[PDB]
Design a protein around this motif. Structure first.
Motif, mmCIF file in Angstrom:
data_model
loop_
_atom_site.group_PDB
_atom_site.id
_atom_site.type_symbol
_atom_site.label_atom_id
_atom_site.label_comp_id
_atom_site.label_asym_id
_atom_site.label_seq_id
_atom_site.Cartn_x
_atom_site.Cartn_y
_atom_site.Cartn_z
ATOM 1 N N UNK A 44 72.561 -12.315 -26.307
ATOM 2 C CA UNK A 44 71.929 -11.636 -27.187
ATOM 3 C C UNK A 44 70.147 -12.325 -26.964
ATOM 4 N N UNK A 45 70.210 -13.531 -26.963
ATOM 5 C CA UNK A 45 68.870 -14.095 -27.088
ATOM 6 C C UNK A 45 68.524 -14.002 -25.246
ATOM 7 N N UNK A 46 69.252 -13.913 -24.566
ATOM 8 C CA UNK A 46 68.991 -13.831 -23.211
ATOM 9 C C UNK A 46 68.791 -12.359 -22.722
ATOM 10 N N UNK A 47 69.149 -11.353 -23.462
ATOM 11 C CA UNK A 47 69.298 -9.776 -23.345
ATOM 12 C C UNK A 47 68.148 -9.325 -24.008
ATOM 13 N N UNK A 48 67.263 -9.942 -24.797
ATOM 14 C CA UNK A 48 66.143 -9.530 -25.552
ATOM 15 C C UNK A 48 65.245 -8.518 -24.808
ATOM 16 N N UNK A 49 64.727 -9.267 -23.687
ATOM 17 C CA UNK A 49 63.829 -8.686 -22.875
ATOM 18 C C UNK A 49 62.662 -7.900 -23.492
ATOM 19 N N UNK A 50 62.148 -8.453 -24.672
ATOM 20 C CA UNK A 50 61.180 -7.681 -25.326
ATOM 21 C C UNK A 50 59.980 -7.539 -24.586
#
Length: 50
Positions: A44-50
Motif C-alpha cells: 500500500x505504502x509502496x504502491x501509492x505512486x502519488x
C-alpha cells in the motif's frame, strides 16, 4: 433425531482430547494471517505512486 454418529465420531472424540495441541496452533494461525497484513501494508505504502 439425537444422532451423533457413534461410528467414527466416537472414535474421533478420543483423539480430539489433545489439549496439548490446542494452543500453540492458534499462535501459528496469527503467523499466517498477521504475516500478510505486514507485507500487505508494505504494498500500500509502496504502491501509492502519488
Amino acid at each position: 433425531a439425537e444422532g451423533d454418529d457413534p461410528a467414527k465420531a466416537a472414535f474421533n472424540s478420543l483423539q480430539a482430547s489433545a489439549t496439548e495441541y490446542i494452543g500453540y496452533a492458534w499462535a501459528m494461525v496469527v503467523v499466517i494471517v498477521g504475516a500478510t497484513i505486514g507485507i500487505k501494508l508494505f504494498k500500500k505504502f509502496t504502491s501509492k505512486a502519488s
